[PDB]
Amino acid sequence: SSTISFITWNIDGLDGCNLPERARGVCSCLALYSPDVVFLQEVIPPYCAYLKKRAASYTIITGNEEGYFTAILLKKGRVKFKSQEIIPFPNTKMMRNLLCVNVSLGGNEFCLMTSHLESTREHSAERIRQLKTVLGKMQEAPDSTTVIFAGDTNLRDQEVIKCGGLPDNVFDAWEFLGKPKHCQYTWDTKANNNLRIPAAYKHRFDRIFFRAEEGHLIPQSLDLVGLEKLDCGRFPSDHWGLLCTLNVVL
DNA sequence: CCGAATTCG
Ligand SMILES: *OCCCCCCN
């Protein structure tokens, strides 16, 4: 009743192979789960055009119009759009930024945020600086609003540790749920074959952070999506997506 | 997008 739902997913728009099957896979997931909000990363303009035709029950807010970029989709008749804000990462080398959408949903106000933090091992320093910027913006939000960040952070655990960890008032949804093993890795070369990497690597790149008054926002479930291998023998993306439901109390 | 290689202005 007062439950809200969202999916966050890096859909790998930079991979040009099997795009029509993969996009159908993404739109199938979105239509069948029909979450209130969808956070997307690594979208490209033809992918955006596809979503407008094949996911028309959502209003699409985008992080850029060129290259690859993020987007937030809002369920028509369920989410009320109030404002949009985009904040640059001045030192990015990969056009990354912070997309914020303020909405009303189920009678409550939310600041929804997504980003695709700087990629690869060698760009650890800038990734960490971007993480700090995001957390900073979460904390500067009006306390009247509930802030939810969901995105592809590209983080390694040691990177969070070395920068001091999350602030006391920002929670990681996966940690909040007791670190369940079933959705621990969202990028996994043994379970996912899209990149054709021989060695076995696995990471929790996709993460959900939230800031809210005590007891107000209670994560209920977190599951992987995009697990069905497609006709071509690959997955919709090199990432699993995350589907989260949360209860909103008063 | 790991870790490494190639292309070219
Ligand atoms: O996923 C981010 C794209 C960066 C691609 C780097 C390829 N090694």
Coordinates of C-alpha atoms (C1' of nucleotides) and ligand atoms in Angstrom, one line a residue:
Chain A
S1 CA 0.0 0.0 0.0
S2 CA 2.6 2.5 1.1
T3 CA 5.3 0.4 -0.5
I4 CA 7.5 2.0 -3.2
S5 CA 9.6 0.1 -5.7
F6 CA 12.5 0.9 -8.1
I7 CA 15.0 -0.8 -10.4
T8 CA 18.6 0.5 -10.8
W9 CA 20.5 -0.8 -13.8
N10 CA 23.5 -0.1 -15.9
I11 CA 22.2 -1.3 -19.3
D12 CA 25.6 -1.2 -21.1
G13 CA 24.6 1.0 -24.0
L14 CA 28.3 1.1 -25.0
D15 CA 28.1 -2.6 -26.0
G16 CA 26.8 -2.5 -29.6
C17 CA 26.3 -6.2 -29.9
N18 CA 22.8 -7.8 -29.8
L19 CA 21.3 -4.5 -28.8
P20 CA 17.8 -5.2 -30.1
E21 CA 17.5 -8.5 -28.1
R22 CA 19.1 -6.9 -25.0
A23 CA 16.8 -3.9 -25.1
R24 CA 13.8 -6.1 -25.5
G25 CA 15.1 -7.9 -22.4
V26 CA 15.4 -4.7 -20.5
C27 CA 11.9 -3.5 -21.5
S28 CA 10.4 -7.0 -20.7
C29 CA 11.8 -6.7 -17.1
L30 CA 10.5 -3.1 -16.8
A31 CA 7.0 -4.1 -18.1
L32 CA 6.7 -7.2 -16.0
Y33 CA 8.0 -5.8 -12.7
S34 CA 6.5 -2.3 -13.4
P35 CA 8.4 -0.5 -10.6
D36 CA 7.5 3.1 -9.6
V37 CA 10.9 4.4 -10.6
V38 CA 13.7 3.2 -12.9
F39 CA 17.3 4.5 -12.5
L40 CA 19.4 3.8 -15.6
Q41 CA 23.0 4.2 -16.5
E42 CA 25.0 4.1 -19.7
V43 CA 22.0 4.9 -21.8
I44 CA 22.6 6.2 -25.4
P45 CA 20.3 8.2 -27.6
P46 CA 18.9 5.2 -29.7
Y47 CA 18.3 3.4 -26.4
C48 CA 16.5 6.4 -25.1
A49 CA 14.3 6.5 -28.3
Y50 CA 13.6 2.8 -27.8
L51 CA 12.4 3.3 -24.2
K52 CA 10.1 6.1 -25.3
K53 CA 8.3 3.6 -27.6
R54 CA 8.6 0.5 -25.6
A55 CA 8.3 1.8 -22.0
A56 CA 5.7 4.6 -22.6
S57 CA 4.1 4.2 -19.2
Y58 CA 7.2 6.0 -17.9
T59 CA 8.1 9.7 -18.2
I60 CA 11.8 9.8 -19.0
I61 CA 14.2 12.4 -17.4
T62 CA 17.8 12.3 -18.9
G63 CA 21.3 13.1 -17.6
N64 CA 22.5 14.2 -21.1
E65 CA 21.4 14.1 -24.7
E66 CA 24.8 13.1 -26.2
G67 CA 27.3 10.3 -25.7
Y68 CA 26.2 8.0 -22.9
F69 CA 24.3 9.2 -19.9
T70 CA 22.0 8.4 -17.0
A71 CA 18.2 8.6 -16.9
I72 CA 15.4 8.4 -14.4
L73 CA 12.0 7.0 -15.5
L74 CA 8.8 7.9 -13.6
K75 CA 5.6 5.8 -13.6
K76 CA 2.8 7.9 -15.1
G77 CA -0.2 8.2 -12.8
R78 CA 1.9 7.2 -9.8
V79 CA 4.8 9.6 -9.6
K80 CA 4.4 13.4 -9.7
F81 CA 7.4 15.3 -11.2
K82 CA 8.3 18.4 -9.3
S83 CA 11.7 19.5 -10.5
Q84 CA 15.0 18.2 -12.1
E85 CA 18.6 19.2 -11.3
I86 CA 21.9 18.2 -12.9
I87 CA 25.2 18.7 -11.2
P88 CA 28.5 18.3 -13.1
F89 CA 31.6 16.4 -11.9
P90 CA 34.2 19.1 -12.9
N91 CA 37.1 16.7 -13.0
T92 CA 35.3 13.8 -14.8
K93 CA 37.1 12.4 -17.8
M94 CA 34.0 10.3 -18.8
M95 CA 31.1 12.9 -18.8
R96 CA 29.8 11.6 -15.5
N97 CA 27.4 13.8 -13.4
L98 CA 24.7 13.8 -10.7
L99 CA 21.1 13.6 -11.9
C100 CA 18.5 14.6 -9.2
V101 CA 14.7 14.4 -9.6
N102 CA 12.4 15.8 -7.0
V103 CA 9.0 14.0 -6.9
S104 CA 5.9 13.2 -5.0
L105 CA 4.9 9.5 -4.6
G106 CA 2.3 8.0 -2.4
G107 CA 1.8 11.3 -0.7
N108 CA 5.5 11.7 0.2
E109 CA 8.3 13.8 -1.1
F110 CA 11.5 12.3 -2.5
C111 CA 14.8 13.5 -3.9
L112 CA 15.8 10.7 -6.4
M113 CA 19.4 10.7 -7.5
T114 CA 21.5 8.6 -9.9
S115 CA 25.0 8.7 -11.2
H116 CA 27.5 6.4 -13.0
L117 CA 30.8 7.1 -11.1
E118 CA 34.2 7.2 -12.9
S119 CA 35.1 3.7 -14.2
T120 CA 38.1 1.4 -14.0
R121 CA 40.8 0.6 -11.4
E122 CA 43.1 3.4 -12.6
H123 CA 40.5 6.1 -11.9
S124 CA 40.0 5.2 -8.3
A125 CA 41.0 8.7 -7.1
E126 CA 38.3 10.5 -9.2
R127 CA 35.7 7.8 -8.4
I128 CA 36.3 8.5 -4.7
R129 CA 36.1 12.3 -5.2
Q130 CA 32.8 11.8 -7.0
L131 CA 31.5 9.6 -4.2
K132 CA 32.3 12.3 -1.7
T133 CA 30.4 14.9 -3.9
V134 CA 27.3 12.6 -4.1
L135 CA 27.3 12.0 -0.3
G136 CA 27.7 15.8 0.2
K137 CA 24.7 16.6 -1.9
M138 CA 22.7 13.9 -0.1
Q139 CA 23.4 15.6 3.2
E140 CA 22.7 19.1 1.9
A141 CA 19.2 18.2 0.9
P142 CA 16.3 19.8 2.9
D143 CA 15.5 17.5 5.9
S144 CA 11.8 17.7 4.8
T145 CA 12.8 15.3 1.9
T146 CA 13.8 11.7 1.8
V147 CA 16.9 11.1 -0.4
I148 CA 17.5 8.0 -2.4
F149 CA 20.6 7.5 -4.5
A150 CA 20.7 4.4 -6.7
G151 CA 23.4 4.0 -9.3
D152 CA 26.5 2.3 -10.7
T153 CA 29.2 3.4 -8.2
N154 CA 32.0 1.2 -9.7
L155 CA 33.2 1.0 -6.1
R156 CA 35.6 -1.5 -4.5
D157 CA 35.1 -2.2 -0.8
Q158 CA 38.6 -0.9 0.1
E159 CA 37.9 2.4 -1.6
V160 CA 34.9 3.1 0.7
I161 CA 37.1 2.1 3.7
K162 CA 40.1 4.2 2.7
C163 CA 37.8 7.3 2.4
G164 CA 36.3 6.7 5.9
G165 CA 33.1 4.9 5.0
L166 CA 29.6 6.2 4.8
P167 CA 28.5 9.0 7.0
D168 CA 26.3 8.0 10.1
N169 CA 23.1 9.3 8.5
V170 CA 23.5 7.6 5.1
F171 CA 22.5 3.9 4.8
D172 CA 23.4 1.3 2.2
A173 CA 20.2 -0.7 1.5
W174 CA 22.1 -4.0 1.0
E175 CA 23.9 -3.5 4.3
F176 CA 20.6 -2.5 6.0
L177 CA 19.0 -5.8 4.8
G178 CA 21.8 -7.8 6.5
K179 CA 24.1 -8.2 3.5
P180 CA 22.1 -11.0 1.8
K181 CA 24.2 -13.4 -0.3
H182 CA 21.6 -13.6 -3.1
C183 CA 22.2 -10.1 -4.5
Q184 CA 25.8 -9.5 -3.2
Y185 CA 27.4 -9.2 -6.6
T186 CA 26.0 -7.2 -9.5
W187 CA 29.0 -7.6 -11.8
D188 CA 30.3 -11.2 -12.0
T189 CA 32.4 -12.7 -14.8
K190 CA 31.6 -16.3 -13.8
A191 CA 27.8 -15.8 -13.7
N192 CA 27.6 -13.3 -16.5
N193 CA 29.4 -13.8 -19.9
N194 CA 28.7 -10.5 -21.7
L195 CA 32.3 -9.3 -21.5
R196 CA 34.0 -12.6 -22.3
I197 CA 36.6 -12.3 -19.5
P198 CA 38.3 -15.6 -18.8
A199 CA 39.3 -14.8 -15.2
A200 CA 36.8 -14.8 -12.3
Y201 CA 36.1 -11.3 -10.9
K202 CA 33.1 -10.2 -9.0
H203 CA 32.0 -6.8 -7.5
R204 CA 29.1 -5.0 -5.9
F205 CA 29.3 -2.0 -8.3
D206 CA 25.6 -1.1 -8.1
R207 CA 24.6 0.4 -4.7
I208 CA 21.6 2.1 -3.1
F209 CA 22.2 4.9 -0.5
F210 CA 19.4 6.6 1.4
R211 CA 19.0 9.3 3.9
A212 CA 15.8 9.6 5.9
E213 CA 14.4 10.4 9.3
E214 CA 14.4 7.4 11.7
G215 CA 12.0 4.6 10.8
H216 CA 10.6 6.5 7.8
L217 CA 12.1 4.4 5.0
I218 CA 12.4 0.7 5.6
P219 CA 13.9 -1.4 2.8
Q220 CA 11.9 -4.6 2.4
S221 CA 13.6 -6.6 -0.4
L222 CA 16.5 -6.4 -2.8
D223 CA 16.8 -8.8 -5.8
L224 CA 18.9 -9.2 -9.0
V225 CA 17.1 -8.6 -12.3
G226 CA 18.3 -9.3 -15.9
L227 CA 19.2 -12.9 -15.0
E228 CA 17.4 -14.5 -18.0
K229 CA 20.0 -15.4 -20.7
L230 CA 18.6 -14.2 -24.0
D231 CA 18.1 -16.1 -27.3
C232 CA 21.5 -15.0 -28.5
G233 CA 23.1 -16.6 -25.4
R234 CA 24.0 -13.4 -23.7
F235 CA 22.4 -11.3 -20.9
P236 CA 20.7 -7.9 -21.3
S237 CA 23.8 -6.3 -19.8
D238 CA 27.2 -7.0 -18.2
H239 CA 25.6 -5.8 -14.9
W240 CA 22.7 -7.4 -13.0
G241 CA 20.1 -4.8 -12.2
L242 CA 18.7 -4.3 -8.7
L243 CA 15.0 -4.3 -7.8
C244 CA 14.3 -2.8 -4.4
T245 CA 11.0 -2.4 -2.5
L246 CA 10.7 -0.2 0.5
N247 CA 8.0 0.7 3.0
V248 CA 7.4 4.3 3.8
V249 CA 6.1 5.0 7.3
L250 CA 4.3 8.3 7.8
Chain B
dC1 C1' 34.0 -3.2 -18.0
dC2 C1' 39.3 -6.8 -16.0
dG3 C1' 43.6 -6.1 -17.8
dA4 C1' 45.8 -5.5 -21.7
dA5 C1' 46.6 -3.9 -26.7
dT6 C1' 45.8 -0.8 -30.9
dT7 C1' 44.9 3.5 -33.5
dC8 C1' 45.9 8.0 -34.5
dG9 C1' 45.8 13.2 -34.3
Ligands
LIG1 O1 31.8 0.7 -18.2 C1 32.5 1.8 -18.3 C2 33.0 1.9 -19.7 C3 34.5 1.8 -19.7 C4 35.0 0.9 -20.7 C5 36.5 0.5 -20.4 C6 36.9 -0.6 -21.3 N1 38.0 -1.3 -20.7

